[PDB]
Design a protein around this ligand. Structure first.
Ligand SMILES: [Mg+2]
Ligand SMILES: [Mg+2]
Ligand SMILES: [Mg+2]
Ligand SMILES: [Mg+2]
Ligand SMILES: [Mg+2]
Ligand SMILES: [Mg+2]
Ligand SMILES: [Mg+2]
Ligand SMILES: [Mg+2]
Ligand SMILES: [Mg+2]
Ligand SMILES: [Mg+2]
Ligand SMILES: [Mg+2]
Ligand SMILES: [Mg+2]
Ligand SMILES: [Mg+2]
Ligand SMILES: [Mg+2]
Ligand SMILES: [Mg+2]
Ligand SMILES: [Mg+2]
Ligand SMILES: [Mg+2]
Ligand SMILES: [Mg+2]
Ligand SMILES: [Mg+2]
Ligand SMILES: [Mg+2]
Ligand SMILES: [Mg+2]
Ligand SMILES: [Mg+2]
Ligand SMILES: [Mg+2]
Ligand SMILES: [Mg+2]
Ligand SMILES: [Mg+2]
Ligand SMILES: [Mg+2]
Ligand SMILES: [Mg+2]
Ligand SMILES: [Mg+2]
Ligand SMILES: [Mg+2]
Ligand SMILES: [Mg+2]
Ligand SMILES: [Mg+2]
Ligand SMILES: [Mg+2]
Ligand SMILES: [Mg+2]
Ligand SMILES: [Mg+2]
Ligand SMILES: [Mg+2]
Ligand SMILES: [Mg+2]
Ligand SMILES: [Mg+2]
Ligand SMILES: [Mg+2]
Ligand SMILES: [Mg+2]
Ligand SMILES: [Mg+2]
Ligand SMILES: [Mg+2]
Ligand SMILES: [Mg+2]
Ligand SMILES: [Mg+2]
Ligand SMILES: [Mg+2]
Ligand SMILES: [Mg+2]
Ligand SMILES: [Mg+2]
Ligand SMILES: [Mg+2]
Ligand SMILES: [Mg+2]
Ligand SMILES: [Mg+2]
Ligand SMILES: [Mg+2]
Ligand SMILES: [Mg+2]
Ligand SMILES: [Mg+2]
Ligand SMILES: [Mg+2]
Lengths: 197, 106, 172, 49, 127
RNA sequence: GAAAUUGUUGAAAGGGAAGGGCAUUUGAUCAGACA
RNA sequence: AGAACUGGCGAUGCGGGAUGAACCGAACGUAGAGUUAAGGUGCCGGAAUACACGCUCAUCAGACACCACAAAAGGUGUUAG
RNA sequence: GCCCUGAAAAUGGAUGGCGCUCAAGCGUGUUACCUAUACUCUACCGUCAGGGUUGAUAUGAUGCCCUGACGAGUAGGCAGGCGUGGAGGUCAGUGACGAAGCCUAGACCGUAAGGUCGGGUCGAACGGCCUCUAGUGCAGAUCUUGGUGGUAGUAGCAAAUA
RNA sequence: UUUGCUCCACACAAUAUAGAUGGAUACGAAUAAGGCGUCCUUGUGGCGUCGCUGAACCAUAGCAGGCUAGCAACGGUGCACUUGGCGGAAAGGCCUUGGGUGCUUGCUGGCGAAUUGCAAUGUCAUUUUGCGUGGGGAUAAAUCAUUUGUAUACGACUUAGA
C-alpha cells in the first residue's frame, strides 16, 4: 500500500502487534514501530514482571555470554515478541527482519511522517474493559532499562512542537473550508455533487 | 500522465505447501485490494508477469519477465493460486508481481 | 448436537395375532434431523416400556412448527442431567421466540455451566410460562420491567483493513 | 555429590574478566552528582604515583 | 527429415547415482542397490535419492529415439552404412570410434549419396 | 603412466561441519531441429 | 513377568500426533488435474485475528486421545442448581 | 462448574516456540477454508489375463492387433537382462592414415546393470553377433600386499659441570 | 614506486538490486468518551455539528505525454538563485522573503501520431565501483628495524629517536 508504514505503538497489545508486524514483513512490507514504551501487555504489572524474571534466569550455565540474552528496552522486548514469529534463522527470515525497525518515542524522520494504528491489536478494542494490563515502559524500567525519563522528557518536547504544527494546520484548513464554501452553490459544485463529490 | 499502470499490484507469498512440504509448481499470490474468494474470482485467468532485471543484455534488454496466469482462489481472505511458465524462484517470496486485465471479459 | 427441529414421533409395538392394534405412544423430540429423532424416540421408549426398535415400528414422524414464531416468550425448562459424580434434576427459564431456539441455548448452557455434553441431558418438559409473576428466575424477571431501556456501552467496530488512520472510538 | 565440607569460593566474580586492561590510564566510569549551586570546578585530577 | 513421432518425453533425465558415491571416493557413481537392514535409501525415507524402477521406462513409441527422431546405428565401413539404405528416416549412422580418418571420409561420402544421416560427421576431420 | 594424495593457475562458495532430494533464478557450457 | 482373540511393528515408506518402531489417517510403478482423511487455519505455517451462547483472572492460570502424572481434604472467589 | 489452597529437588527451559486474557484459554454449536504416496479422471512403463490374426506377393509367429485388472516389501524363491578372462563359428569386422589403455562438472541411448561418440593422451594389437567355458563383478571381513593422508613443520632433539 | 588525493560537474563504461511503477498524507489525550465549528464569564463552561471506517484526502487528460497559437486570471507549480527564521533524539530536514525562469488540462484554437502490423515488462528505477578529461580545495602518516620496562611466553603493551 505504502513504501513504509509507521505504527504508533501506544495502546497496542505486544503479541498482537507482533503477530501482524511479522506477517507484513514476510509479505514484503517495510515497517517501523514507534512509541514502543507505550506498548501494552494483558495482565497486571506484577505478573508480567514475574514473567520477565523467568526469562531472566535462563542462561548458559557454563558461560552466561553464550546463553540467552535479555534485552530490557521496550523496543527490544517487542523485537523479541516479533522475532519469535519469524523463521529468523533462514535467509528469508533475516530478510524480513531487515524491513523492520522499532523505536522508543518518535525520533526524526518518523516524527513528521504520519503513524497508523492496527485495530486488531489495539488494546482499547480488544481487552474486555475491566481486565488489568501493563505498560512496557513501566515494565522495562523495572527490569533495568535506563532511559524512561529521557524518552519522557524528549517526547514532552516533541509533543509540544507537534501541537504547534497541528494548531497552525487546523487554522489553515479552516481557511480552506471557508474558501470551499463560496465555491458551494456554483455550477461546477452542483455538478460534482451529482457525481458523488 | 504520471500513472501508466495497466495491471494490479500483487505479492509473491509462498509456494503451495503443507506444514513441512512445498510444491514449487503452484505459487500463491496476494492481490491488492482483494479480500474475499468472491472478489478474487474476477482475476481468475488473468495473466501475471513477474518482471526482473539482470546483468547480461539479451534480446536487447536487461529486463526479463516470467509469465503465467492466475488459476483459482485460495482460502477465505482473497488470496489466489497461480502457475507460471517456469516456477518462480522462491527468493521472490515477498517480491511484487503484476496481474493484468486480459483476457478481459467486460 | 446441532440446530434443532422439533418432531412428533409416533410408534407402536409390532402387531401380533393375539394383539393387533397395539397402544401407540408419542414423544415430542428435539433433534437436528428425523434420523436422530427416531433414534432418540427408541432411546426413551426402551426406558419406559418393554419395546425395542427390533420389535417395534415408527408410525409417524412430523415436524412441529412454532405457533407464533415472532412472539417473545418466557420458557421455563425442566431438565435431567448427569454430572461427573451423580445425576441431577434442574429447572431453568429461557426467554426466546421459539421452543426450538430455546432448546438450542439450553443445550449450550448445560454444556457451558455444567460441562454436560448432549448425551448426558434429558429434556423433561419445555413449556411456555403463561402469566408473568410465575417467572421465577431473576435473570429473566430482569427483562420484564415496564418501559425497559438499556444502553450498549463501549462499542467495538470490526476493522476491515489491517491498518487504520484514526484511533478508534467506542462511542455509541 | 556435595562438597563434603563447605568453604566460600576463591576470588570475586565482579572483577572478571581477569585480562589486561585496554589502557594504562584506567577510566573514570563515574563522576560525583552535580550540585549546580556551587562554583565551577574540576571533579578529578591527574598525577603520577 | 526423420519419421514423425509423438513428443519425446524423458520421464527422469537425472542420472541415478549410487548412494554415498558422493561420500567416499571408493564408491563409484554406477547404480547399485542398497541391501542394508537399517538403510534410509532402501527404506525410501522422504529426503533421499530415488532408485530406478520400471515406472520410469520410456514410451514404447519414442524409446531409443534420439533428439532428431532417428534411432542410431553403429557403423564401421561402407557395407554396414549401406544397411540403412531403405531406412533413412528411421536410422542415423554413427561412425565407430576406431574407424580411421581416411575411412571416415569414404563413409560420409557415401552416406551423403545415400541420403543417410551421420551423427558424428566430424571425427578426425582433417581441417 | 589410473587413484588416494600434492603444487601452481583459473572459476566459485563459505556468520558453530560438509555432502544430499524436489524446484526454479542467475552464470557458464552444449545438443537437436529450422529450412 | 506370563496366557486368550484380533489387529499391528518386526519386513513399511507416505499424511497427522513438534519429536518418536507399534497410536490416528492411509499402505507406495512414472506423472497431470481434481477431491479428501487424520489433523489443522493469530504469527512461526498452507488455511476465518470466522460466526454464536456461556464459563474462567490464577503474586507459579490454561491450552486436546495414546502422552509424557497428581490425591484426600478445604475456599464468605465466581457460576449455575 | 471454572478458578484458588492443598502442590518439595537438584546445568537454564519449554501448551513444539512466540505469545495469547469478551483468548490465540475451558464447554458446546454453525459455516468456510488448508493438505497424504489415499479416492475420481487422463497419459506413460511394467506384470497378469482374455480375445484376434500364417493368405500370399517384404522386414521380428518366442511376433503383430484389441481389451481389462493390478504394482509396498526384509529373510527367501524364481525370472529376464548387464559386465569380465578364455573356447568353437561368423562378420572375407577395427587398426601404425593410430589397436588397447588412461583423462574429460563435452554429446547421445537404456528405469538400471551398462552401452555409444567427440576431444586429449597414447603406441600394437582389438571388437560385434550365435554358441562354449569359468580361478567371472567388492566398500566393509581389527580382510591381504602395496601406496597415501590429516595429525604437523607438531611431540620433540633438555641426563653425563664448558 | 611514475601525477597520486579530495568535494562538485558529465562522459563512457561496467556491477549490481529481498523487489519504484500517482502521494509514508505529522497534534495530544480519552474510550463508562472524543473531534470540529462557534459564543462567552476563558471553564471539568454555553450552543451547534460529526462518526457508524482511508470506500478518504490529495493528485490524475496531452509522442512515457510531441510542435505550436490565443484568452481569462495574478492563481497553481517545477527549477536554480536570494531574504530571514526554526529544528541535536539519529537535528542533516522544515518554514519564510524576493526577483528570474519553465509549465499550466482554468477556457478556446492549428499541427503530429498509422506499417511496433490482433498480445509478448516492451526497457522510463537506484546500487556500488572503474577509467580518462577540468571547475574548486588540500599537501599526511602508520608499520619493520632500533629503543625504554610502568609491559611481556610469542604476538601484544608502554617509552624514546632529524
Ligand atoms: Mg408449538
Ligand atoms: Mg553443603
Ligand atoms: Mg587490546
Ligand atoms: Mg552394495
Ligand atoms: Mg545401522
Ligand atoms: Mg530394521
Ligand atoms: Mg613413464
Ligand atoms: Mg537442479
Ligand atoms: Mg529380525
Ligand atoms: Mg506401515
Ligand atoms: Mg511425519
Ligand atoms: Mg506431543
Ligand atoms: Mg479406530
Ligand atoms: Mg517459530
Ligand atoms: Mg498462513
Ligand atoms: Mg469465512
Ligand atoms: Mg480422556
Ligand atoms: Mg475437589
Ligand atoms: Mg465453588
Ligand atoms: Mg502448561
Ligand atoms: Mg500454537
Ligand atoms: Mg471452542
Ligand atoms: Mg501419484
Ligand atoms: Mg514389487
Ligand atoms: Mg552375457
Ligand atoms: Mg567373454
Ligand atoms: Mg581365467
Ligand atoms: Mg573427475
Ligand atoms: Mg552424439
Ligand atoms: Mg584421438
Ligand atoms: Mg586410441
Ligand atoms: Mg612397440
Ligand atoms: Mg553364451
Ligand atoms: Mg574369485
Ligand atoms: Mg558392494
Ligand atoms: Mg577396496
Ligand atoms: Mg573400507
Ligand atoms: Mg557389503
Ligand atoms: Mg582396506
Ligand atoms: Mg623443518
Ligand atoms: Mg617444537
Ligand atoms: Mg625430554
Ligand atoms: Mg636451549
Ligand atoms: Mg650435559
Ligand atoms: Mg538481494
Ligand atoms: Mg461535542
Ligand atoms: Mg474548540
Ligand atoms: Mg463545551
Ligand atoms: Mg482525511
Ligand atoms: Mg504537458
Ligand atoms: Mg532512523
Ligand atoms: Mg491543445
Ligand atoms: Mg583528477
Amino acid at each position: 500500500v505504502e513504501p513504509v508504514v509507521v505504527i504508533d505503538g501506544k495502546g497496542h497489545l505486544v503479541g498482537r502487534l507482533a503477530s501482524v508486524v511479522a506477517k507484513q514483513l514476510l509479505n514484503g512490507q517495510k515497517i517501523v514501530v514507534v512509541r514502543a514504551e507505550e506498548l501494552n501487555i494483558s495482565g497486571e504489572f506484577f505478573r508480567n514482571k514475574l514473567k520477565y524474571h523467568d526469562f531472566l534466569r535462563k542462561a548458559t550455565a557454563f558461560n552466561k555470554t553464550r546463553g540467552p540474552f535479555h534485552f530490557r528496552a521496550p523496543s527490544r522486548i517487542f523485537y523479541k515478541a516479533l522475532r519469535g514469529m519469524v523463521s529468523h534463522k533462514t535467509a528469508r527470515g533475516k530478510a524480513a527482519l531487515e524491513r523492520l525497525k522499532v523505536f522508543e518515542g518518535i525520533p526524526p524522520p518518523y516524527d513528521k511522517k504520519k503513524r497508523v494504528v492496527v485495530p486488531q491489536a489495539l488494546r482499547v478494542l480488544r481487552l474486555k474493559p475491566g481486565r488489568k494490563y501493563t505498560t512496557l515502559g513501566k515494565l522495562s524500567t523495572s527490569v533495568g532499562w535506563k532511559y524512561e525519563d529521557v524518552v519522557a522528557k524528549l517526547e514532552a518536547k516533541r509533543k509540544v512542537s507537534s501541537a504547534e504544527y497541528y494548531a497552525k494546520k487546523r487554522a489553515f484548513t479552516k481557511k480552506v473550508a471557508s474558501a470551499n464554501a463560496t465555491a458551494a452553490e456554483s455550477d461546477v459544485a452542483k455538478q460534482l455533487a451529482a457525481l458523488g463529490y | 500522465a504520471e500513472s501508466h499502470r495497466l495491471y494490479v499490484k500483487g505479492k509473491h507469498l509462498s509456494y503451495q505447501r503443507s506444514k513441512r512440504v512445498n510444491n514449487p509448481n503452484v505459487s500463491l499470490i496476494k492481490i491488492e485490494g482483494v479480500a474475499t474468494p468472491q472478489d478474487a474470482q474476477f482475476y481468475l485467468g488473468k495473466r501475471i508477469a513477474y518482471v526482473y532485471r539482470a546483468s547480461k543484455e539479451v534480446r536487447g534488454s536487461k529486463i526479463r519477465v516470467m509469465w503465467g496466469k492466475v488459476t483459482r482462489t485460495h482460502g477465505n481472505s482473497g488470496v489466489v493460486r497461480a502457475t507460471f511458465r517456469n516456477n518462480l524462484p522462491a527468493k521472490t517470496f515477498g517480491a511484487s508481481v503484476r496481474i493484468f486485465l486480459y483476457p478481459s471479459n467486460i | 448436537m446441532a440446530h434443532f427441529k422439533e418432531y412428533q414421533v409416533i410408534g407402536r409395538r409390532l402387531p401380533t395375532e393375539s394383539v393387533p392394534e397395539p397402544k401407540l405412544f408419542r414423544m415430542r423430540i428435539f433433534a437436528s434431523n428425523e434420523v436422530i429423532a427416531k433414534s432418540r424416540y427408541w432411546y426413551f421408549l426402551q426406558k419406559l416400556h418393554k419395546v425395542k426398535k427390533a420389535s417395534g415400528e415408527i408410525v409417524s414422524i412430523n415436524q412441529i412448527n412454532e405457533a407464533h414464531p415472532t412472539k417473545v416468550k418466557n420458557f421455563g425448562v425442566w431438565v435431567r442431567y448427569d454430572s461427573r459424580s451423580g445425576t441431577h434434576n434442574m429447572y431453568k427459564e429461557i426467554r426466546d421466540v421459539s421452543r426450538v431456539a430455546a432448546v438450542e441455548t439450553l443445550y449450550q448452557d448445560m454444556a457451558a455451566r455444567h460441562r454436560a455434553r448432549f448425551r448426558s441431558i434429558h429434556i423433561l418438559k419445555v413449556a411456555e410460562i403463561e402469566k408473568t409473576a410465575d417467572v421465577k428466575r431473576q435473570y429473566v424477571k430482569q427483562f420484564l420491567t415496564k418501559d425497559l431501556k438499556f444502553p450498549l456501552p463501549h462499542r467495538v467496530q470490526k476493522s476491515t483493513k489491517t491498518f487504520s488512520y484514526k484511533r478508534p472510538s467506542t462511542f455509541y | 555429590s556435595h562438597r563434603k565440607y563447605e568453604a566460600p569460593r576463591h576470588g570475586h566474580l565482579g572483577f572478571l574478566p581477569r585480562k589486561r586492561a585496554a589502557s594504562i590510564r584506567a577510566r573514570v566510569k563515574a563522576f560525583p552528582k552535580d550540585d549546580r549551586s556551587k562554583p565551577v570546578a574540576l571533579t578529578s585530577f591527574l598525577g603520577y604515583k | 527429415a526423420s519419421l514423425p513421432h509423438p513428443k519425446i518425453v524423458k520421464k527422469h533425465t537425472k542420472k541415478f547415482k549410487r548412494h554415498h558415491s558422493d561420500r567416499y571416493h571408493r564408491v563409484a557413481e554406477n547404480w547399485r542397490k542398497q541391501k542394508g537392514i537399517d538403510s534410509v535409501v532402501r527404506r525410501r525415507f522422504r529426503g533421499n535419492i530415488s532408485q530406478p524402477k520400471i515406472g520410469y521406462g520410456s514410451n514404447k513409441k519414442t524409446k531409443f529415439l534420439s533428439p532428431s527422431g532417428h534411432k542410431t546405428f553403429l557403423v564401421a565401413n561402407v557395407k554396414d552404412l549401406e544397411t540403412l539404405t531403405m531406412h533413412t528416416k528411421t536410422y542415423a549412422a554413427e561412425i565407430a570410434h576406431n574407424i580411421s580418418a581416411k575411412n571416415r571420409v569414404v563413409i560420409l561420402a557415401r552416406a551423403k549419396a545415400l541420403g543417410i544421416k551421420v551423427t558424428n560427421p566430424k571425427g578426425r576431420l582433417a581441417l
